[PDB]
Amino acid sequence: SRVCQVTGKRPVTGNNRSHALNATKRRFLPNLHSHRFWVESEKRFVTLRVSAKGMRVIDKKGIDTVLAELRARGEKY
Amino acid sequence: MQVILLDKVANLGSLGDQVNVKAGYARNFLVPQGKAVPATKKNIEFFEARRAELEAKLAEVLAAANARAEKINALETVTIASKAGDEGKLFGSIGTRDIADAVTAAGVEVAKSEVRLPNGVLRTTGEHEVSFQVHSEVFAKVIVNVVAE
Amino acid sequence: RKQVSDGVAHIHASFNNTIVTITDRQGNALGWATAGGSGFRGSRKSTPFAAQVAAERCADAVKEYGIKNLEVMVKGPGPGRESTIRALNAAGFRITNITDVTPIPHNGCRPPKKRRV
Amino acid sequence: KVYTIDEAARTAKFDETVEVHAKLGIDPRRSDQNVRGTVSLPHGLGKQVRVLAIAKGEKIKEAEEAGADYVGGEEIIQKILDGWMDFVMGAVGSKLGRILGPRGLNPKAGTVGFNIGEIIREIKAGRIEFRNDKTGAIHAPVGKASFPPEKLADNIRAFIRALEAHKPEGAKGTFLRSVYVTTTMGPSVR
Amino acid sequence: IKVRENEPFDVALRRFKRSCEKAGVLAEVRRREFYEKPTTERKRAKASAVK
RNA sequence: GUUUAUUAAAAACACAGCACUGUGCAAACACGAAAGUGGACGUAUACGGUGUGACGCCUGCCCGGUGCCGGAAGGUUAAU
RNA sequence: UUGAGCCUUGAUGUGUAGGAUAGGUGGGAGGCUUUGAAGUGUGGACGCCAGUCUGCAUGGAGCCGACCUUGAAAUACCACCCUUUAAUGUUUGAUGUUCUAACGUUGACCCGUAAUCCGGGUUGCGGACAGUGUCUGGUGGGUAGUUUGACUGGGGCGGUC
Ligand SMILES: [Mg+2]
Ligand SMILES: [Mg+2]
Ligand SMILES: [Mg+2]
Ligand SMILES: [Mg+2]
Ligand SMILES: [Mg+2]
Ligand SMILES: [Mg+2]
Ligand SMILES: [Mg+2]
């Protein structure tokens, strides 16, 4: 399900607003990309299905912390 | 990102600088093959402790692997009890573990492979000289005097 | 730019027109000028004179690689076949070898039918 | 430099040949290129001019003593009107027109001094200083500057001959000061 | 065809070209095919060269 | 042969045959927010779309318009 | 590498009376060249082949000005430049060349595993493209929602408001 394992970011609904302001239900998906990550701490690639925002957070926090978060809400990776 | 490097790293790095690199390069190549690391600030001072230590401290300790030779010219003469054949020409002869072992064995403590008697190394009596080695650039001269007793 | 001094003067002399190109040896082409491109159009250019002035224009255009001497390969019938070569000699060229290369099939394609004029 | 190097005139006979050619903007919309009635400069410069006026047989006794030399007479309006090699410069204003003796067919004479109370009044200056510098083709500016008798002393034509920034049209940025001549050429910025 | 002429002269001297090709097999192959009509041309070209 | 089960069986649909056009295969194209699947366990002598409709003799002129294909120097032109 | 700006630098002008292939104003009655010149002799070169510039060079030492005409006068020299152009750079793209490590693999293989899925691993092929997200111009009866007036000797047509 198009959900980012780092941040929760999942698709959300809104409208397309034409020039004449007609609305039409639509969605905003997030920017997912499954990406391989080298955890030094476990001599292994862990691949996460992340949003782009996802990665940036993983940078600043560090895959070790971010994974630690997953492991702490029974997220399986 | 900023990221601080580890090894020398080609057209950008140094060995422990704070360059700034495209994240595509940092993740995917550098940091994974640990040639650099996130400049997490926590780190950038992990490196400031590493900007005082080994450098400022252990180079005035190679100012001791150097001032060992401030006691190479303040004596400037050991004698070897080596005699003389048929005209004041050594009945003995003295090399490196002779000029490092007859250097150590006093107040002049040198490492046996720190005594350059270019060969003469050696084939006669009286005064000679040698090139004493403690540092790569700072060695020092003495005077050796094979005493025919 | 560049310089060579040893070259070739390929002249394409047909019935309606004759074209002239000075190439180096490697057939690498150094400057050209043509009969129709020097004025005279129609019958005008189908003349040995037009071919002469073509050769002059041509030299004043490859004397840019100070071409001291040059072979001369002559293709096609029609005027300015030779008169063009005369202008090369005068112009001031060391005129080495002279060939005729006008292509001759060993009876191959069917040539055009008509000419009920 | 930050302003100008007037020592950047450092082998004619003098460096008066040094010209205020600063730039001005396009005609993008409707704008023009106008130099005033003799642009003076807060420098006197030291020019004893030669001014020819359309004055009368009346002011030939004082309209010649104020940074000038002669004054064309009233019989010499069409008396000296039979020559090509025989025939600032002035024209008093208001209802005085000069196409009956200054119109035909290629020189520039127009601005002078307008005075019917005094032909040389105590305070009436700004004339024996500088000239004009009007439209040339793409721009204007053309004149001269100071001399080999200046320094940062005739660099008062930089804050008062570049201060000569006037109304511009729309879609322009008119500036680019540059003087010098009869030796080398250049300047800085604005 | 080819003349790599040599030392001290400038004249064309190419009288060789009127010894083979040029308008030889060239005015020839130029135009109307021919076919059986050469036969007639070269048949009149022997009736002549008898006398 | 098929077809309006229940007012139309036909000259209507289909049909073999023909033409145009798409598709290099993870094909086009189709069902699918997607995974997956038909096409096909096939591969241009194949697969899709479209029109015409055994066969015989044949199938002319028009590219301005509307579609479509190619193109590009200019002009005009979006977030930014 | 190449398109567009921006900044220095160097090119060139056959309207008529005429010493002559006069760009426009402006400084402007001497600068220049032995810091080695005119004019012969070629080199690259622009081009309406009309003629120009120049590095190299043979060279070897003065030319000019209102000059009277021309609507406007000096190759006397100097400027900010337009005609259009040409070259290094600075900037911004874009287009192109490589790499592998992101990402694709609907090649081969190893294990989970007696498994045509899936995961991991190895290898081969691609590779910063492709693809996807957000934003954005075009297209879009494929879908969708609707509009498509009233008078009228019935309505419609015509006409009328
Ligand atoms: Mg039946
Ligand atoms: Mg029925
Ligand atoms: Mg088919
Ligand atoms: Mg039919
Ligand atoms: Mg038809
Ligand atoms: Mg509808
Ligand atoms: Mg009604």
CATH code of the domain in which B94 resides: 3.10.430.100
Residues 6+ apart with CB under 8 A from D171: D26, D28, D29
Describe the crossing of helices C83-92 and C48-62 by its angle, rounded to 10 degrees.
40
Nearest to B38 among A37, A38, A62 (CB): A62
Say how many CA atoms lie within 13 Å of C29 toward its Cβ.
5
Handedness of CA C87, C93, C99, C103 (dihedral sign): negative
Residues 6+ apart with CB under 8 A from A20: none
What are the backbone dihedrals phi and psi of residue C72, each rounded to the nearest 5 degrees, phi first?
Answer: -145, 105
Chain A residues with CB under 8 Å of B24 CB are none
Query: 3-class secondary structure for D15-28?
Result: CCCCCCCCCCCCCC
DSSP lists the bridge partners of residue C99 as: C73, E2
Look up residue D136 and give its amino acid.
Answer: G
Q: Give the span between the Cα atoms of C11 and C23, in whole angstroms.
A: 11
Distance of D38 CA from G79 C1′ (whole Å):
21
Within chain E, what is the greatest distance between any pair of CA atoms? 51
Count, residues in chain B: 149
The answer to whether residues E3 and E13 touch, using CB atoms and an 8 Å cutoff, is yes
Q: Give the span between the Cα atoms of B13 and B34, in whole angstroms.
A: 13
Q: How far is CA D109 from CA A56, D45, D53, D100, D145, in A?
A: 75, 21, 10, 14, 21
3-state secondary structure of C33: strand
Domain hosting residue C49, numbered range: 1-117
Looking at the structure of chain A, the number of domains it has is 1
Q: Give the span between the Cα atoms of B120 and C52, in whole angstroms.
A: 92
3-state secondary structure of C100: strand
The answer to whether residues C23 and C7 touch, using CB atoms and an 8 Å cutoff, is yes
Q: Taking the mean position of all CA atoms in its chain, how far away is CA C91?
A: 14
Interface test with C, best of E14, E18, E19, E28 (most C CBs within 10 A): E14
Joined tokens for residue D95: 């209802």
Within chain C, what is the greatest distance between any pair of CA atoms? 52
Describe the crossing of helices A63-72 and A52-61 by its angle, rounded to 10 degrees.
110
The answer for D119, left when phi > 0, alpha when psi is -120 to 50, beta otherwise, is alpha
Q: Give the span between the Cα atoms of A65 and A72, in whole angstroms.
A: 10
DSSP C11: E
The answer to whether residues D80 and D86 touch, using CB atoms and an 8 Å cutoff, is yes
The answer to whether residues A33 and A21 touch, using CB atoms and an 8 Å cutoff, is no
Q: Give the span between the Cα atoms of C95 and E4, in whole angstroms.
A: 9
Nearest to C113 among E3, E21, E33 (CB): E33
Of D16, D18, D15, D35, the C-alpha closest to D136 is: D35
Nearest to A38 among B1, B32, B40 (CB): B32
- Which residue of chain B comes nearest to A59, CA vs CA? B38
Q: Give the span between the Cα atoms of C11 and C100, in whole angstroms.
A: 10
Find the C77 Cα to ligand 2 centroid distance in Å. Answer: 87
Pairing of the two strands C31-34 and C18-23: antiparallel
Residues 6+ apart with CB under 8 A from B145: B77, B78, B79, B80, B126, B127, B128
Looking at the structure of chain C, the number of domains it has is 1
- Which residue of chain C comes nearest to E4, CA vs CA? C97
Residue ranges in E1-51 assigned as alpha helix (H): 38-47
For residue A31, what is the domain's CATH number? 2.30.170.40
Place of tokens 């004759």: C18
How big is chain A by its Cα radius of gyration, in Å?
16
Burial call C28-41: b when 16+ CB within 10 Å, e when fewer: eebbbbbbbebebe
Q: How far is CA C64 from CA C28, C91, C97, E15, in A?
A: 15, 14, 22, 33
From the alpha carbon of C60, which nucleotide's C1' atom is closest?
G49
Residues 6+ apart with CB under 8 A from B34: A40, B6
Say how many CA atoms lie within 13 Å of E20 toward its Cβ.
10
Count, residues in chain A: 77
Neighbours of E11 (CB within 10 A): 8
Joined tokens for residue E17: 């070209």
Beta strands in D1-129 (DSSP E): none
Domain hosting residue A15, numbered range: 1-77
Q: Give the span between the Cα atoms of B119 and B101, in whole angstroms.
A: 17
Place of tokens 């080999």: D148
Query: 3-class secondary structure for chain A?
Result: CCCCCCCCCCCEEEECCCCCCCCCEEEECCCEEEEEEEEHHHCEEEEEEEEHHHHHHHHHHCHHHHHHHHHHCCCCC
Q: Give the span between the Cα atoms of A67 and A5, in whole angstroms.
A: 9
The answer for D47, left when phi > 0, alpha when psi is -120 to 50, beta otherwise, is beta
Query: 3-class secondary structure for chain B?
Result: CCCEECCCCCCCCCCCCCCCCCHHHHHHHHCCCCCEECCCCHHHHHCCCCCCHHHHHCCCCCCCCCCCHHHCCCCCCEEEECCECCCCCECCCCCHHHHCHHHHCCCCCCCCCCEECCCCCCCCCEEECCEECCCCCCCCECCEEEECC
The answer for C78, left when phi > 0, alpha when psi is -120 to 50, beta otherwise, is left
Chain A residues with CB under 8 Å of B34 CB are 40
Nucleic strand G within 7 A of Cβ A38: no
